[PDB]
């Protein structure tokens, strides 16, 4: 794994095995990294953006590719993780947070440029804490006698969800499935959510000062078909002895969005197996 | 005990011995933990919610299962307890309360992931004090090189009682007992009480930002039958020499709710034995 | 013995008689020395490394081969032993410790190049005390008009145990025994423990500046089968009159690791016979 | 005596004559040494641990067996004694204390391996002063061309008393005597007191790094029956002319623990005879 440059087959295989729907994410991720990781000269690190609705698999997919790259998954000493609240709660110690940030970066990357960093809960940040990293995302071949363009920086959020929602019902109201929705959607309004001078969108506004991001990538509500997928596949994978009635109860005993149609889920495949344990309790 | 994974028989036995009514709680608890504790891969810690009326046995049942798991019950070094007021009175020292919180957590859990935490008196809290724990309730296999998904976090309150009351008289007014009331009841209005921007419900509103809770579980007023149960069973268990007249006085000398029906208790089995000591005084 | 070059049969015989499990150690040791001792031109002394969990037989196996080589075992004037604490407690007298070290070396080896040195308790050392011996582990045919490449230097520790543990439950969690685990395991993480700038791992970091070590060799927790082996074999060897119930009490009256599975021992065959004397006391 | 290997009869006889209660200690000691002293190959010295409450006979029993082994008792040149405070007061001269320790050891043991050492007042020690002796408690057949595995090292303390107390009232509250309490009791919590990073328990924490101890052995409060035993037996042994009223005054004129039950003694048979001299004064 760690001694394997990821071939396309392994990743399309993995996602097609476990990922439900999200054709966009398979296309994007597969071709994007498969070009990137095979490139000995990326010219830049990987600046990925994610937002939308939960339980669609953000930390899921990040975990998966983390496992395919390194056996450590998240256990790898290379793969070192940060969080907003656990590390960076307050606007008091912003400077310490910046210095500690820069140094912990230089440590892990100076171990190897193929190390990976991820952030999470980015609705609770303070733009000084981007002001210490934009130079690291210059396409410069180096900084301080070190190159960073092999590493890969990945973000997470949920803002801008309202656009992917009302668009989802837009085309779906057109007698259509999001398979037929294309990858291109209104990246202008995404730029607004990302220009949105709310601290969530203001953070990424000052980051998008130069589109240091590579690719905006929203996920979508795992439709009740996906519920049934992560009910059948999971409970049959767990020796759970599920049957049909339990999968009548996916929709007989769940709330979807909006009420007036009862379509878009509230969790997808996040709270699915707990409620399925109720359906063991039946 | 501590070297015993709890079999179903032991727990249904215990609850059927000592717990009066609360069929819902026996079903929920028994199957829920019995699936959870036997699961070597829970994918998440146990995020339990409780609210409703007192004296129905919240701290009672938590105590019981604490004893069945570990001989320490609450004496266990693993089982380390926090309280709102005793530890976290003021909105002044919120930050210290968060840091001390995180560290005391990491201590006990780093002793073992099967440690247990409980909170109480959650009507007196401040949402910063959830903002330090939501990452711990990611389904992440780890944080900071440590996994938390085996541990079990349990909360307590009494808000939202009005719904379980007016529903209780709803179906009971229908010529019916809450045995015939099903577990499913209006979890939407429960979400409102849990969305209720009152600090009690606002706390759990920002927690229910992702339904990090597993199962909402209300208790109900221990009906005067339950009084008579925890009068006969207790006083016969205590060598008290109770007789019939003392159990005429359970209702001849007590207030129930509402007045116009005199049905729902005020304490259930909490103040029962003190008033029974009056009936020794007769 | 001392006039015997160790044939393979004698050593595989001895280990297969007395050593329980540790297939890796039989393979490694047997072929390694059997090639080494029979080699009139080793090109280097034997640079052995050991770490892991106790009571698996480090000082046991070193004792055994010491006996097979020379009748003295440890009594041999050739076989002269050093210890961290007994000889080299403080960082004050480091220089005296280095000079005395070099001279005591030159004495014993100048008696014969087939002399043996062992160290122990290597978590309490100071890198100056390797800085006097790395030249002795050049593959040079000589130093100061003397050759050292026939002698054999052996170390001991317990650091890096966490890796052999979590790996042991890794493959064992895979429905598997460590017989099916191969000798190859993650020698990268072993290099980290051996790069671990802790003084224990920093010592061996500056030693592994050139991999002057030959073979990393961890031992593993002597599984409760091995307990029962060194209960039956020992007590039947001691005329102890053991029976079945005493070997019910190996697990009825012992702690294993983790609690949640009760698998990996705490001592293996170290404290076994004392507790068995309790089972005489029964 | 010194030319006598202790037969079982002599020791069970002696303890059954003079020792009051402490069935556990008779079983442990008798079988343990009787197997040990008769063993020509112990494989280790005797690593005994003692803690609990005073006046139950620690220095008493150590004295007794010291007398049975050698006529010198404590007068023997073989039996050479150390104390924390008298010899090892300060953390200033720790090194001198270690060197003097090692040398005085080597002296007495080189006189004979059947020499005995005891320590006392071990709540006032400094872990450097174990760091010089753990090698002596390797099961090695020798060190420095000398074997130590015949000698016997014995410790004393009073920490961890709280566990033997609250357990004593646990089973005693169960309608029961500690005769019916078994030898097995919560050796986990004993390990905590012995892991207790207090210097008293931290000392023995770094010793229990390898369970170099053989057997944990607590004593218990000599119950008022034992008072009356060491009142009748002693005063009748002393020609004191005791009568009944004096043994009404054992409890009419003494404090026990807790107040609310007045059960567990404060001294047992330590201050007993002085207060009995008051009852001569009556
Ligand atoms: N598309 C999917 N197919 C199958 N299972 C999924 C899918 N998406 C999510 N899950 C499951 O749901 C759970 C939640 O996934 P994950 O945490 O990655 O979503 P998320 O967007 O990271 O949530 P949040 O945004 O709150 O961090 C996981 O346990 C995962 O296995
Ligand atoms: N269902 C029941 N059957 C028998 N006894 C009960 C029951 N419920 C409560 N009791 C008794 O009533 C007392 C109160 O129980 P408990 O404190 O668990 O209720 P609670 O909901 O925790 O109260 P609060 O909400 O005020 O903390 C206990 O002493 C318990 O033994
Ligand atoms: N695999 C085994 N089979 C049988 N007996 C064993 C085995 N391993 C250890 N023992 C016994 O356990 C005791 C401890 O062995 P030994 O001291 O060699 O372990 P160790 O790793 O050297 O301990 P430490 O690391 O603390 O020095 C010895 O008396 C030995 O006979
Ligand atoms: N079980 C017993 N039966 C009869 N006499 C006893 C018993 N235990 C103690 N004594 C008497 O009480 C006195 C105190 O005994 P001893 O000093 O051995 O207790 P200790 O635990 O060593 O005290 P400390 O812990 O303070 O050193 C002695 O004089 C002894 O004779």
Residue numbers in the entry:
A (entry chain A), B (entry chain B), C (entry chain Q), D (entry chain O): 51 to 332
What do the study's own words say?
Torsins are essential proteins that belong to the AAA + (ATPases associated with a variety of cellular activities) superfamily. Torsins are restricted to multicellular eukaryotes and they exclusively reside in the endoplasmic reticulum (ER) and the connected perinuclear space (PNS). From a medical perspective TorsinA is important, since a deletion of glutamate 303 in TorsinA, TorsinAΔE for short, is the founding mutation for early-onset primary dystonia, a devastating and still incurable neuromuscular movement disorder.
Surprisingly, and in contrast to most AAA + ATPases, we observe that the filament has a central channel with a diameter of ~4 nm. The EM density for the small domain of TorsinA is less well defined than the large domain, potentially indicating some flexibility. There, the rearrangement of residues 232–262, is critical to prevent steric clashes with the nucleotide bound to the neighboring unit. We presume that the TorsinA filaments are nucleotide bound for two reasons: first, we observed EM density at the nucleotide-binding site, and second, we observed robust filament formation only in ATP-containing buffer. We performed an NADH-coupled ATPase assay and observed no ATPase activity. The electrostatic surface along the inner channel of TorsinA shows an undulating pattern of positively and negatively charged stripes.
